[PDB]
């Protein structure tokens, strides 16, 4: 097996999600089905899916195009809020593990109020007082530190409580903050927003209290260039600092498009992967709505291929992933007729790479991933899922497992693909078609016979029999192994009343009779073999039938005319033997008949055959 522990667990989860859609059940939450395995690994992966769920848990317009949802200002706004809610809660967990040694340890004693937690967080991260703080303290801590880390944790209420106990010190900041907490989308009114920004810009552009600076332009979304590096030293603190500063419809203003493009264009992977920590960059792209970038990026880490494919599937089963129309493009690209700030993922290629790894010895699991390509076609019109099953069968040669083995008793035990579509007639011909083009007739027959395509089964069975008609049928020979399959196809084609056009069909049952004629001839059962050839009315034995038999030879399958030489000789040698054992006249007359027939028929080795036939007739007299 080519699948690692993690990859295998995901496969099982994707089998469920397929079993549900294959039986018409409720469309379960894919993101939940993937996070179910994440908990079996380190929390590096669990915290990823947590971000994936929260970033995709946005009210969408079902049955709407992918590009439309992702271009709409409506959806683009909720992404920023879902991310900020993740950066705030994520930071809140950092503040817990900073005070208590373990999340469990914090829980048993009880998570304290965000206010008392933050206070018990300031104790550690600033033990001694910084001399540059302003506006005094509140219950033993600087008022601005409390406000910042409370807003950072996302509890505006806890921050407003701090403000209520410092009404005299904070001046007019109270009426401004109380408006920020009330107004939605973390924005103030243009009039009041103007009043505070100008005040900050007036004489507080450079204040000795960094926490004061941070809060002001987090509330006013100002000084976008100043990264407030004094307080936002971590990467998440930067993302959170900026997403609280982005704006929507000229100076000192930043928008999501600029920010998202500004980040990866100027400070690409190189900047965010110098510490050899891959998820850091992924979180930067995913929490900025650049899902295709983050997916391709994370898909290149050979250790995190599994995770990047699935986060792509989630975005794909939620009409959020922007697929690349052309299949000839690179993995990541920007369509020419699209805005430059969005990118597109060649989803077809993405799955095709992941599959090649474990498609060789783990076919069942491969199909589960090929199903997501059911909705796509190629330039030639083939259904992508169907084509992927053809290529996977041509390579793996797993016919019984994937296509269903058709035993020699008339049964068709369904295969693994039967689960996904009930119309399995084309691919069985596709797989049968190539194997036919590769001279693998004995297989192409079994495959065509699996799809009950007798036109092709009998055609190929005619080719495999004609060479072996006069041969000696011996144990385990190529004659027995082909005759016995032909008879197993004769019964199942009569018991089920199946037949190809009379040309193909007539020749097929005719060869089977001839194969019996030589099997009796090679055994010495002369009398019995003579009777068979007489029924077939293939070789004339009375002079009257020569005219009609000669005309019939003209339109009989060349697979029959080929073996005419051996038939005449065996029949002659049959009469020849019976002569040495009135009757003499009758054999003599029949001997003549064979000669005149052979004389009027142009066929294989007519030279040596016509001569031998005449000699055997002379010895009779």
């Amino acid at each position: 097996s080519s699948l690692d522990n993690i990859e295998m667990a995901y496969a099982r989860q994707i089998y469920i999600y397929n079993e549900k859609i294959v039986n018409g059940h409720l469309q379960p939450n894919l993101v939940d089905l993937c996070a179910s395995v994440a908990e079996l690994d380190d929390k590096s992966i669990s915290d990823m899916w947590t971000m994936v769920k929260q970033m995709t848990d946005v009210l969408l317009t079902p049955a709407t195009d992918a590009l439309k949802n992702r271009s709409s200002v409506e959806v683009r706004m909720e992404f920023v809020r879902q991310a900020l809610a993740y950066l705030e809660q994520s930071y809140k967990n950092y503040t817990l593990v900073t005070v208590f040694g373990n999340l469990h340890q914090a829980q048993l004693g009880g998570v304290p109020g965000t206010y008392q937690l933050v206070r018990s967080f300031l104790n550690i991260k600033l033990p001694a007082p910084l001399p540059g703080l302003q506006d005094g303290e509140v219950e033993g801590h600087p008022v601005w530190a409390l406000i910042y880390y409370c807003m950072r944790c996302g509890d505006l209420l806890a921050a407003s409580q701090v403000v209520n106990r410092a009404q005299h010190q904070l001046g007019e900041f109270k009426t401004w903050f109380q408006e920020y907490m009330n107004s939605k989308d973390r924005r103030l009114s243009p009039a009041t927003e103007n009043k505070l920004r100008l005040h900050y810009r007036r004489a507080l552009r450079n204040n000795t209290d960094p926490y004061k600076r941070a809060v002001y332009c987090i509330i006013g979304r100002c000084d976008v260039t100043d990264n407030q590096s004094e307080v936002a030293d971590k990467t998440e603190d930067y993302l959170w600092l900026k997403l609280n500063q982005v704006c929507f419809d000229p100076q000192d203003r930043l928008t999501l498009s600029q920010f998202q493009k500004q980040l990866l264009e100027d400070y690409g992977e190189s900047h965010f992967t110098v510490n050899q920590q891959p998820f850091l960059y992924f979180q930067v792209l995913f929490l900025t709505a650049q899902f295709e970038a983050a997916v391709a990026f994370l898909f290149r880490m050979e250790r995190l291929r599994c995770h990047a494919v699935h986060v792509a599937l989630v975005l794909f089963e939620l009409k959020l992933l922007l697929k690349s129309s052309g299949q000839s493009a690179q993995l990541l690209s920007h369509e020419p007729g699209d805005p430059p700030c969005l990118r597109r993922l060649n989803f077809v290629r993405l799955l095709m790479l992941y599959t090649r790894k474990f498609e060789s010895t783990d076919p069942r699991e491969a199909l589960q991933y090929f199903y997501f390509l059911r909705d796509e076609k190629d330039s030639q019109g083939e259904n992508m899922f169907l084509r992927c099953v053809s290529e996977l069968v041509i390579e793996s040669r797993e016919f019984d497992m994937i296509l269903g083995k058709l035993e020699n008793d008339g049964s068709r035990k369904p295969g693994v693909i039967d689960k996904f579509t009930s119309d399995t007639k084309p691919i069985i011909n596709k797989v049968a078609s190539v194997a036919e083009n590769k001279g693998l007739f004995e297989e192409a027959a079994k495959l065509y016979d699996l799809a009950k395509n007798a036109d092709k089964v009998l055609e190929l069975m005619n080719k495999l029999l004609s060479p072996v008609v006069p041969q000696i049928s011996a144990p385990q020979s190529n004659k027995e192994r082909l005759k016995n399959m032909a008879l197993s196809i004769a019964e199942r084609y009569r018991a089920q009343g199946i037949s190809a056009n009379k040309f193909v069909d007539s020749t097929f049952y005719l060869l089977l009779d001839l194969i019996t004629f030589f099997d009796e001839y090679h055994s010495g059962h002369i009398d019995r073999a003579f009777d068979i050839i007489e029924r077939l009315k293939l070789v004339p034995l009375n002079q009257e039938s020569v005219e009609e038999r000669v005309a019939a030879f003209r339109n009989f399958s060349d697979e029959i005319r080929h073996n005419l030489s051996e038939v005449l000789l065996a029949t002659m040698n049959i009469l020849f033997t019976q002569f040495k054992r009135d009757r003499d006249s009758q054999l003599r007359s029949q001997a003549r008949t064979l000669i005149t027939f052979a004389g009027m028929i142009p066929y294989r080795t007519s030279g040596d055959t016509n001569a031998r036939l005449v000699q055997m007739e002379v010895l009779m007299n």
Partner: protein, 76 residues
């Protein structure tokens, strides 16, 4: 060659029968390829359809148009 020239008796509403022949022939052709032709056959079946509308047995013709358009798909 018969359907275009329209030399008698292959004229007028009798060309409805010419299309029936073309449907039978081409149908027996794709069925003989799928058991085991180019643009010019697709050019014809589409051109054969103009004949059926140009002639518009009101239900026979209607059913026949849907046999032609079926073969055009089978070739393309």
């Amino acid at each position: 060659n018969v359907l275009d020239t329209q030399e008698a008796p292959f004229t007028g509403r009798r060309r409805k029968l010419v299309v029936q022949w073309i449907a039978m022939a081409v149908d027996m052709w794709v069925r003989e390829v799928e058991r085991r032709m180019g643009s010019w056959v697709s050019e014809l079946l589409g051109r054969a359809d103009q004949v059926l509308t140009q002639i518009a047995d009101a239900e026979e013709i209607a059913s026949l148009r849907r046999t032609v358009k079926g073969l055009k798909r089978s070739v393309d």
